[PDB]
Design a binder for these strands. Structure first.
Ligand SMILES: [Zn+2]
Ligand SMILES: [Zn+2]
Lengths: 183, 148, 56, 92, 96, 31, 119, 56, 98, 147
RNA sequence: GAGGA
């Protein structure tokens, strides 16, 4: 609800199998291009590698998965601190821009409040984990049609959207007339 | 067989133990002294600030009324407390971060030398992380090293 | 179908209708057959449009 | 009283429905040849039993007599046609 | 004077069923037994306690009255616990 | 769905980004 | 294989050579922490993997309703109660072999009669 | 005819049995994948062939 | 189909509250390598925590639904093999009785 | 087939071998990079026995050691002889190459460059697995005899 | 919208 805002974060895994340097770049809203993930993780405050892998490969025997990850670690090895990471994103304001993007546009459906970077970090780690799990052939790709993944918008939600929009417009115009009463 | 509507008739026819007071602290000592939480991260398990170093300072790094986006003051106020605070010497450092996770249900028990325990409502909670432990960051130089 | 255990490869678990149209189909079989039949309908619908365009 | 239960597609993934109440779980125990070939109970750890299978059909399909003897495309055609039939649509 | 005051006060922390926590953000008497604790209210219900983490490491408590300001570091987390529920009467109130 | 809407969603659409630089929106009434 | 982390830096301990005694030296390229190796092995590829077949064997799997049940007698234990399933490898070229889980001693064992397997 | 009916039935039963035997063998990992196709595919094809032969 | 209905959605908060009340170590204190058997607990796809002994939890949740305490249109899956326990009070789901 | 040879299934197998594109990756099992600076004593005491031969009748300290499957090596009817030939002739310029003998119960092949190694070596191994057509011709995947 | 075929 709440002027329902649809932000579609995606994670992309680069390069076919065997093609060396398979690296994972995440996609954020309002960003020049994809970002190597480890950048994002540090941008959320998980700085060390070991902590990041802990955020991703939940079992420390999955050296399979760890090997899969290592390229992204090496990719991100350049940056080593949070604020640098926020610098990567696009003043004197660039950092604050990045931070506010994360607090409002990165995974809206977790929160848009102040301190939950631990959450969004963990959740992102999980998302990556599942992507890896697929690309390691241990789950099959998602079934696009499983009816559990569908929803039906009955008269309720349809009118909900429609009316929310109309009413937002009505507020806009009321405010505008209020202004035109500068006189 | 066939569908039978006579079943209406069918049913119709068939029918050590310590104990302490937990006193409330004076409002006044609280009224300036907000309480918060310390969390470092280095896994250098002990992290004793006493044995960190010294001295250990701590500090944070048109027309008439027109359209304003509204919000409760505190978040606005929280938004406006964005200078994280650090421990230094004048070498080791630590930088804290706002947890914002469980300010709800956390009451600090005043485990003093006296057994009386005052239930201190934890006000905030911060996660502290080291920094400049290798001062190796090339914020603009590094971006050069990326493309190569 | 949820009416089955997991990893059953027995013919009726994966869709071997056995009764005749005379004997009628058990609900699984009925459903399976419905899936097959819809595939048929779709293929026909697509195929006519194709062959129409090809012929033109 | 928790005798009946609402189940959606996601949860369906982790249950074990029985088709017919009785025969599917009486116990482990001569057959009319005309009767179709029901499989068995064959399993024990059910958790739910279907209310009645004929409820998988939608509205239009429910008109068809014996739709379990027909070839499915026929069912679909009827479901479509049934909306053309003349008849009383409303009492007023 | 930018520095701590003592930086050693070893304190305890608990997590309280919020139906009871909000009551405490504005005394009591507690059975502080051995590794088995229940909580008598300053009265309705009766509650129990668990020891979540005895080794309460890395973590301490501080307080406050390039922008600096004055600070007073209370001291350590001595240990922390968590509250659980008259637990039947509480659970009856809990389910809501 | 419709009842749910007209009983809750209608209101909580209003009790939202409602107040305007001030003007307030309160209880919503349906005839 | 394994990875290593700079017990102070806590980062990827890359390997390196001693260059005089010429033994391995893991070095944190964020820091100065250095260590040798426990093994001369550095990396291993494993292009055909026998792992992941019997994955997620939790000490709860007996509670799964949908899982089938056999009678085959446990070798380790001797129950005749068992849940069995195919490999979780979910690769196209995967065998059909079954993995039985005793419901008493929770001891995995396989349907295989080629040899003995352990996932 | 009746006799014909139960003869049909037992024919189907034979089919089921052959399928089952193939299955048991596959799960004993004794199935030999004909060249050029997956073990799993080989099994699946075998089953489909049996079933169609049975129907006919 | 004849008996299928469509969920209308429910405020999830009380469920989350209850979960916290019954375990569900909150996320921020989750340390995987030492808590390897935790079942991730989701709600409307929002990973809210982890928990141990999920079995009894699931039991309790089920029971609660089965006496109207939790609105019965709420689905509650417990994938045993993925150590996940999703929940949805989401509006728009499709469900049928049993 | 040419008319010879009209019906000699044996001949057909010969050809099928002769044309089917067979790559190194398809025959091995797992690849491993070791640190053995010892020219002539494998850290492992199993390839070491091989080093008792295949060694003698300016180096690098980084062994790359290779494991293949006997079943595939024989279905493809391959001999670590030929494969060694393949890799050797593919370089002969950088790698002393040693293979277990086709007798050996395990299919073990060892190579060493003659630096900033352990990263280039990775590229090399990838190239070995992928860009090495042991026999047969490109784009030919599966050859299935028929009558 | 509809829609038969
Ligand atoms: Zn280091
Ligand atoms: Zn056993």
């Amino acid at each position: 609800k709440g002027s329902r805002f649809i932000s579609t974060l995606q994670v992309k895994l680069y390069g076919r199998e065997g093609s060396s340097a398979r690296t994972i770049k995440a996609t954020l809203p309002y960003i020049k291009q994809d970002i190597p993930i480890v950048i994002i993780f540090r941008a959320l405050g998980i700085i060390p590698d070991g902590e990041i892998l802990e955020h991703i490969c939940y079992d420390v025997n999955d050296w399979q998965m760890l090997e899969m990850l290592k390229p992204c670690v090496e990719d991100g090895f350049v940056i080593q601190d949070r604020e640098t990471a926020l610098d990567f994103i696009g003043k004197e304001k660039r950092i604050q821009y990045a931070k506010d993007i994360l607090q409002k546009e990165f995974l809206p459906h977790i929160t848009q409040l102040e301190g939950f970077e631990s959450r969004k970090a963990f959740f992102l780690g999980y998302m990556i984990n599942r992507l890896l799990l697929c690309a390691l052939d241990r789950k099959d790709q998602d079934d696009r049609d499983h009816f559990g993944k569908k929803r039906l918008d009955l008269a309720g939600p349809l009118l909900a959207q429609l009316f929310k929009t109309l009413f937002k417009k009505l507020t806009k115009d009321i405010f505008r007339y209020m202004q035109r009463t500068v006189e | 067989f066939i569908k039978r509507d006579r079943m209406r008739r069918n049913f119709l026819r068939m029918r050590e133990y310590n104990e302490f007071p937990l006193r409330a602290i004076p409002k006044e000592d609280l009224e300036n002294m907000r309480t918060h939480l310390l969390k470092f991260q280095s896994k250098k398990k002990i992290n004793p600030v006493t044995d960190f170093h010294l001295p250990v300072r701590l500090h944070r790094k048109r027309k008439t009324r027109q359209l304003k986006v509204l919000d409760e003051n505190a978040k606005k106020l929280r938004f406006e407390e964005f200078y994280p605070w650090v421990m230094e010497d004048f070498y080791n450092t630590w930088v804290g971060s706002y947890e914002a996770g469980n300010s709800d249900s956390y009451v600090l028990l005043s485990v003093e030398d006296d057994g009386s325990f005052t239930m201190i409502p934890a006000d905030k909670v911060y996660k502290f992380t080291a920094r400049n432990k290798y001062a190796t960051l090339t914020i603009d130089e590094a971006e050069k090293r990326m493309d190569k | 179908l949820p009416h089955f255990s997991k990893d059953d490869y027995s013919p009726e678990s994966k869709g071997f209708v056995e009764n005749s149209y005379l004997r009628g189909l058990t609900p699984q079989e009925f459903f399976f057959h419905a899936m097959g039949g819809r595939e048929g309908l779709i293929d026909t619908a697509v195929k006519t449009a194709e062959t129409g365009y090809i012929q033109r | 009283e928790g005798l009946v239960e609402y189940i959606d597609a996601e949860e369906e993934e982790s249950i074990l429905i029985a088709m017919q109440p009785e025969d599917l779980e009486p116990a482990e125990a001569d057959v009319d040849p005309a009767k179709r070939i029901r499989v068995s109970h064959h399993a024990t750890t059910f958790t739910h039993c279907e209310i009645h299978p004929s409820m998988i059909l939608g509205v239009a399909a429910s008109i068809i007599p014996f739709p379990d003897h027909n070839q499915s495309p026929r069912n679909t055609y009827q479901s479509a046609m049934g909306k053309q039939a003349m008849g009383v649509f409303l009492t007023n | 004077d930018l520095d701590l005051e003592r930086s050693n006060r070893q304190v305890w922390l608990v997590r309280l069923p919020m139906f009871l926590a909000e009551k405490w953000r504005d005394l009591g008497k507690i059975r502080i037994n051995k590794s088995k604790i229940t909580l008598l209210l300053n009265e309705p219900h009766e509650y129990d306690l668990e020891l979540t983490k005895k080794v309460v490491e890395n973590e301490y408590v501080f307080t406050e009255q390039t922008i600096p300001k004055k600070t007073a570091i209370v001291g350590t987390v001595c240990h922390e616990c968590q509250v659980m529920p008259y637990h039947k009467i509480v659970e009856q109130r809990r389910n809501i | 769905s419709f009842n749910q809407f007209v009983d809750y969603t209608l209101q909580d659409i209003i009790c939202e980004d409602s107040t305007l630089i001030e003007i307030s929106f309160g209880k919503i009434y349906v005839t | 294989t394994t990875f290593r982390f700079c017990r102070d830096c806590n980062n990827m301990l890359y390997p390196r050579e001693d260059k005089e005694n010429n033994r391995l030296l893991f070095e944190c390229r964020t820091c100065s922490y250095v260590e040798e190796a426990g093994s001369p092995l550095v990396y291993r590829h494993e292009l055909i993997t026998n792992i992941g077949e019997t994955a997620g064997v939790v000490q709860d799997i007996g509670s799964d309703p949908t899982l089938p049940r056999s009678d085959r007698e446990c070798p380790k234990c001797h129950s005749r109660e068992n849940v069995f399933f195919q490999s979780q490898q979910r690769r196209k070229d995967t065998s059909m072999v079954l993995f039985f889980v005793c419901l008493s001693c929770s001891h995995i064992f396989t349907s295989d009669q080629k040899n003995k397997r352990t996932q | 005819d009746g006799p014909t009916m139960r003869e049909i039935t037992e024919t189907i039963a034979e089919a089921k049995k052959k399928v089952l035997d193939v299955t048991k063998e596959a799960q004993a990992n004794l199935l030999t994948a004909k060249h050029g196709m997956t073990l799993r595919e080989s099994f699946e094809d075998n089953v489909v062939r049996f079933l169609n032969e049975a129907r006919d | 189909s004849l008996m299928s209905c469509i969920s209308v959605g429910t405020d999830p908060m009380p469920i989350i509250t209850f979960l916290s009340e019954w375990g569900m170590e909150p996320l921020e204190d989750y340390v995987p390598h030492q808590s390897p058997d935790a079942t991730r607990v989701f709600v409307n796809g929002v990973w809210h925590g982890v928990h141990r002994n999920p079995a009894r939890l699931m039991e309790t949740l089920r029971t609660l639904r089965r006496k109207g305490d939790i609105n019965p249109e709420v689905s509650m899956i417990r994938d045993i093999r993925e150590k996940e326990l999703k929940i949805f009070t989401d509006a728009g789901r499709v469900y049928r009785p049993l | 087939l040419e008319p010879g040879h009209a019906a000699d299934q044996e001949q057909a197998k010969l050809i099928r071998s002769a044309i089917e594109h067979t790559t190194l990756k398809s025959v091995t099992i797992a690849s491993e990079i070791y640190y053995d600076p010892d020219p002539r004593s494998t850290v492992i005491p199993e390839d070491e026995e091989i080093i008792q031969l295949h060694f003698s009748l300016q180096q690098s300290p980084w062994l790359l050691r290779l494991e293949l499957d006997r079943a595939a090596m024989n279905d493809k009817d391959l001999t670590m002889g030929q494969v060694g030939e393949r890799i050797k002739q593919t370089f002969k310029n950088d790698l002393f190459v040693i293979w277990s003998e086709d007798n050996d119960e395990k299919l073990i092949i060892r190579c060493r460059v003659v630096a900033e190694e352990d990263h280039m070596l990775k590229k090399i191994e990838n190239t070995m697995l992928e860009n090495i057509t042991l026999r047969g011709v490109e784009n030919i995947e599966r050859v299935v005899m028929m009558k």
